[PDB]
């Protein structure tokens with residue numbers, strides 16, 4: 001299992017020690033407060049009221065927690081995933097990333113605390 | 122070995138000549154272009170941007186190629202499977218199917234060309 | 243057999259460990275999502291709607307997976323090849339390459355995951 | 364080896380396929396013309412006349428080519444590195460980056476063409 005922080009201003013994301021392998025079932029729980037700019041902060045689901053101006057993940061809100069597995073495209077994490085299995089042909093280290101528009105991470109703040117573990121399978 | 126076409130609008134699926142037997146190793150390669158409704162077409166992985174609105178296979182995108190072995194649950198095929206072995210207790214004729222919402226196949230178009238063969242074991 | 247990934251941003255492609263020899267029968271299965279610039283992503287068949295502006299392979303769409311065998315010309319791979327035998331004489335290491343216009347790979351993203359194996363002959 | 368281009372306007376840089384490991388000896392050659400905003404363009408050593416207004420790399424001119432390896436700090440690349448060995452405890456993926464002030468990449472233009480290879484060691 002892995003536990004750590006993902007900073008909202010980290011554009012390249014936080015690489016974890018979890019290597020997702022084919023067939024793996026995983027659980028993720030994410031908590032905390034962060035912002036893509038405003039002084040207000042939001043949780044791991046992001047800001048449901050904010051428009052998508054070119055987010056790295058178009059299937060989650062701005063300010064949401066997302067991830068990449070190996071060199072996959074972004075996948076929404078939000079508050080977490082429960083006994084979750086990746087699509088076919090997706091594998092590799094899990095990298096956690098705050099959902100924002102490329103080039104605009106500089107004014108972000110806060111972080112999410114995240115647990116990831118592999119489940120019985 | 123089997124080679125044939127799977128029409129996107131064929132809700133029942135295309136039954137192939139391949140009977141999958143315990144211990145069998147198979148390879149599938151799929152190609153072509155199809156749509157679940159829009160003018161655009163997609164390849165065998167389907168449309169990654171599209172929400173799951175009640176697809177026959179929740180483990181693949183809308184417009185992806187999937188299959189049933191005998192009466193198994195749906196199994197993602199996508200662009201294909203390389204030297205793949207079925208889950209415990211899965212056996213019978215392989216049926217190829219376009220991934221869409223039941224009752225909505227009528228506006229589908231295009232097809233995938235698919236090869237299936239058995240590998241050494 | 244060989245399994246690995248090829249970056250859309252790499253003009254040099256990915257050299258594999260497969261040496262294609264006269265008479266060899268091979269199978270390739272490719273999957274994944276990549277872009278040659280636009281926000282959308284496409285599978286290994288590429289973008290069937292995009293014009294050819296000087297692609298390294300004129301026989302496949304922009305954004306498709308292609309290959310070279312030794313010092314051959316580019317050969318389309320797309321989603322894969324099923325028990326495929328090459329054009330006469332062709333031989334040498336297989337290099338996998340993303341199909342784009344030379345000099346323009348700078349805005350490319352994503353990758354394809356590929357399995358290659360030799361079949362019986 | 365890796366071959367490609369690095370867009371001047373990409374704040375996140377260009378993540379190559381090269382993973383730098385302890386002991387590796389690498390060569391990089393970079394060419395081309397790019398700008399941090401003005402209509403003029405400069406080569407990979409950037410603009411020797413331009414003041415540092417908060418560059419991501421203080422050891423290179425604005426408009427220069429630099430890199431990170433894994434999560435290292437920025438390392439000047441300029442026109443390239445000849446049979447180069449990294450500092451102790453530096454390792455990981457090579458990301459190439461245009462040297463500009465954070466939050467100001469949006470008006471940049473052009474790119475550098477870059478080759479990276481591992482040398483014998």
Ligand SMILES: [O][C][C]1O[C](/O=C2/[C]=[C]C3=NC4=C([C]=C([O])[C]=[C]4)OC3=[C]2)[C]([O])[C]([O])[C]1[O]
Pocket residue numbers: 036037038051052053062100101104105107
């Ligand atoms: O998207 C992303 C971005 O965001 C920003 O912030 C902000 C804030 C506020 C706002 N509002 C509005 C808009 C638009 C429209 O249309 C209306 C309204 O937007 C916005 C934004 C930040 O700052 C940045 O950085 C980014 O992240």
Ligand SMILES: [O][C][C]1O[C](/O=C2/[C]=[C]C3=NC4=C([C]=C([O])[C]=[C]4)OC3=[C]2)[C]([O])[C]([O])[C]1[O]
Pocket residue numbers: 157158159172173174183221222225226228
């Ligand atoms: O899913 C399945 C279905 O699909 C359809 O198509 C379509 C088109 C378009 C669209 N759009 C949108 C949606 C959702 C949301 O949320 C938004 C937007 O969806 C859709 C869909 C068809 O028609 C049918 O048939 C089926 O397939």
Ligand SMILES: [O][C][C]1O[C](/O=C2/[C]=[C]C3=NC4=C([C]=C([O])[C]=[C]4)OC3=[C]2)[C]([O])[C]([O])[C]1[O]
Pocket residue numbers: 278279280293294295304342343346347348349
């Ligand atoms: O080809 C290749 C290339 O591509 C690009 O992208 C793009 C985008 C958009 C567009 N649009 C149009 C065209 C043409 C015509 O004629 C019209 C319209 O194109 C295009 C393109 C990129 O960016 C690059 O890089 C390359 O890849």
Ligand SMILES: [O][C][C]1O[C](/O=C2/[C]=[C]C3=NC4=C([C]=C([O])[C]=[C]4)OC3=[C]2)[C]([O])[C]([O])[C]1[O]
Pocket residue numbers: 399400401414415416425463464467468470
């Ligand atoms: O650095 C960086 C920046 O840059 C800019 O651009 C520019 C242009 C011009 C100029 N001039 C001058 C200066 C300073 C002093 O002191 C004097 C003069 O600066 C400048 C700048 C841009 O726009 C931005 O974006 C950035 O990149």
Ligand SMILES: [Ca+2]
Pocket residue numbers: 035036037100104105106107108
């Ligand atoms: Ca922001």
Ligand SMILES: [Ca+2]
Pocket residue numbers: 157158221222225226227228229
């Ligand atoms: Ca439909």
Ligand SMILES: [Ca+2]
Pocket residue numbers: 278279342346347348349350
């Ligand atoms: Ca391109």
Ligand SMILES: [Ca+2]
Pocket residue numbers: 398399400463464467468469470471
């Ligand atoms: Ca600038």
